[PDB]
């Protein structure tokens, strides 16, 4: 099967550069035109660049022309996008794609790019426990608030993975250079407590892990 | 440059039933070569785009014939003769006749199911947050249907909007419900000079708001 695996995304400053890569396999890479696309955080798709199979011809929308450069190492099955003069607007999920059948037939998995001058910041992780004895005394719902981090992503698990049903982890929202997210978990009021419920939050960009046990207030 | 306008924005549809989506171009996609470069693609939630259609009507061979593309000029339709669970996602049309390639904005395809009122839970701020000198009240509204919901915050029976922060999940592909959280953020100081904290959810399933509340 045709396969496209993009790499190289991460946090960059406005004005900065970043070079993305796309490892192609399972087809004769050097026989096809290739492209880059991006999906903005509000899910707009946009065309970013295209290069002839041989590498002679390159094409750009006005919005990236002059700033971005597409090329390829045929010997080595790799597509590249050298991005310069980055601006917040280029913040997107970038996809490698193959041009065939009068358009595009395959898409890779995406690599994520954020252009921002905001600071890397580890999350605060607050435990959320109720008051009373549960409305539906049978099920209790808990959570944690993951506040104040940058950039994306964090991961949230409950008791290390083993409490996976009953979980809603909400998409993060950016509100002043800082993301906030919450997760809820829903368990028999007979297993809490009794047994412990812990949220495990990880934030790779600050190499931080937080394990917050949910203890019943007062 | 070429404007691509897709309609409707979202479409809820019924397992078993047909569906159609529309896409208009600001200008003709016909090229002086007889061929029309009009494409459809699907993005399933959290997955990568998947080709669906090219040259108006040619089917990608991983896709079933349930789907048919048609149109000419400036008007195109994608139709699904009978919708399955896995059709959930965003459908984009896109044009490559005129330089530069451009995309329509996406039609989100949603699945119908029995109404559900949200299970609503309120949480006061944590002791830990309060020592940071801030306070957030959090409200979970979980596993409801349909997507449309309204949540207001009340502080001592006032109403407050100017520190709230909402977030919605995607339609769950297991139970087809939605969930939402609402976070009200204040200073410790504001929060300690008021008593009653209310989270009020208006859903279509009721006439009356779900009210959740605590004193202190």
């Amino acid at each position: 099967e045709v396969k496209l695996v993009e790499s190289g995304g991460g946090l960059v400053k406005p004005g900065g550069s970043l070079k993305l890569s796309c490892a192609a396999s399972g087809f004769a890479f050097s026989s096809y035109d290739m492209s880059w696309f991006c999906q903005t955080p509000e899910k707009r798709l946009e065309w970013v660049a295209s290069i002839s199979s041989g590498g002679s011809y390159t094409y750009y929308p006005d919005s990236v022309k002059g700033r971005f450069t597409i090329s390829r190492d045929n010997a080595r099955n790799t597509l590249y996008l050298q991005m310069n003069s980055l601006r917040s607007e280029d913040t997107a999920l970038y996809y490698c794609a193959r041009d065939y059948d009068y358009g595009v037939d395959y898409w890779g998995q995406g690599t994520s790019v954020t252009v921002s001058s905001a600071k890397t910041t580890p999350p605060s992780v607050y435990p959320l426990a109720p008051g009373s004895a549960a409305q539906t005394n049978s099920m209790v719902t808990l959570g944690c608030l993951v506040k104040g981090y940058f950039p994306e992503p964090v991961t949230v698990t409950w008791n290390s993975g083993s409490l996976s049903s009953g979980v809603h982890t909400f998409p993060a929202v950016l509100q002043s250079d800082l993301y906030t997210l919450s997760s809820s978990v829903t368990v028999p009021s007979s297993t809490w407590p009794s047994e412990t419920v812990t949220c495990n939050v990880a934030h790779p960009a600050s190499s931080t892990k937080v394990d917050k046990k949910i203890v019943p207030r007062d | 440059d070429v404007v691509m306008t897709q309609t409707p924005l979202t479409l809820s549809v019924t397992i078993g039933q047909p569906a159609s989506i529309s896409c208009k171009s600001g200008q003709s996609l016909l090229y002086s070569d007889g061929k029309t470069y009009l494409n459809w693609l699907l993005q399933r939630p959290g997955q990568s785009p998947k080709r669906l259609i090219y040259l108006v009507s040619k089917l990608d061979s991983g896709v079933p014939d349930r789907f048919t593309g048609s149109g000419s000029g400036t008007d195109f339709t994608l139709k699904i003769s009978r919708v399955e669970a896995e059709d959930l996602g965003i459908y984009y049309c896109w044009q490559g006749t005129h330089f530069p390639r451009t995309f329509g904005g996406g039609t989100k395809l949603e699945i119908k199911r029995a109404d559900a009122a949200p299970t609503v839970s309120i949480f006061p701020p944590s002791s830990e947050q309060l020592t940071s000198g801030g306070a957030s009240v959090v409200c979970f509204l979980n596993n409801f249907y349909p997507k449309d919901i309204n949540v207001k915050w009340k502080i001592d029976g006032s109403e407050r909007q100017n520190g709230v922060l909402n977030s919605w999940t995607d339609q769950d592909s297991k139970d087809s419900t939605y969930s939402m959280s609402s976070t009200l953020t204040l200073t410790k100081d504001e929060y300690e000079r008021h008593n009653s904290y209310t989270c009020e959810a208006t859903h279509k399933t009721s006439t009356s708001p779900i009210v959740k509340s605590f004193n202190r």
């Binding site: 035109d33 295209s50 002839s52 002679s56 011809y57 094409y59 041009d99 065939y100 059948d101 009068y102 358009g103 | 090229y31 070569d33 470069y37 490559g96 006749t97 005129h98 330089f99 390639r101």
Partner: peptide, 9 residues
């Protein structure tokens, strides 16, 4: 080659 019109011949 099954290219879009704006592509190089």
């Amino acid at each position: 080659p099954k290219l879009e019109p704006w592509k190089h011949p």
